[PDB]
């Protein structure tokens, strides 16, 4: 499923993402936009370390989910990576929360640092009623 901007904003808010560990909803919106373009079935294979990124937040199989084919990987979210390709993003949201519970917080994703850190993210939630 590909979310429409405001649809996703409200979806994320109802899931308790606004201000989770100090990260505004707008930041989450900017992350999803640059990671998958709001596409829940987006995947990206990394040939170098044989891992893959899954879903709207492009979460990596080396540490966060299990896809059974990433050498020496762990599964911190205790989820099959398939759970990260569902149209319903509740599981992806629980895992994204787990990801930012680590040291880096939202900086865990390089894309956020490149397109959201220090830039304008308020534009992502404007007019969405959140």
Curated annotation (Swiss-Prot):
List of catalytic residues: 35, 53
This enzyme's EC code(s): 3.2.1.17
Transmembrane annotation, as ranges: none
Catalytic activity entry: Hydrolysis of (1->4)-beta-linkages between N-acetylmuramic acid and N-acetyl-D-glucosamine residues in a peptidoglycan and between N-acetyl-D-glucosamine residues in chitodextrins
Annotated Gene Ontology cellular component terms: azurophil granule lumen; extracellular exosome; extracellular region; extracellular space; specific granule lumen; tertiary granule lumen
Subcellular localization(s) per the UniProt record: Secreted
SMART domains per record: LYZ1
Record key words, sorted: Amyloid, Amyloidosis, Antimicrobial, Bacteriolytic enzyme, Disease variant, Disulfide bond, Glycosidase, Hydrolase, Secreted, Signal
Source species, domain of life: Eukaryota
Disulfide bonds: 6-128, 30-116, 65-81, 77-95
GO biological process entries: antimicrobial humoral response; defense response to bacterium; defense response to Gram-negative bacterium; defense response to Gram-positive bacterium; inflammatory response; killing of cells of another organism
Keyword Lipid biosynthesis: no
Occurrences of domain C-type lysozyme (ranges): 1-130
Protein family membership: Belongs to the glycosyl hydrolase 22 family.
Function: Lysozymes have primarily a bacteriolytic function; those in tissues and body fluids are associated with the monocyte-macrophage system and enhance the activity of immunoagents.
Subunit-structure text: Monomer.
Note: Lysozyme C is capable of both hydrolysis and transglycosylation; it also shows a slight esterase activity. It acts rapidly on both peptide-substituted and unsubstituted peptidoglycan, and slowly on chitin oligosaccharides.
Name the record gives this protein: Lysozyme C
Organism: Homo sapiens
Encoding gene per record: LYZ
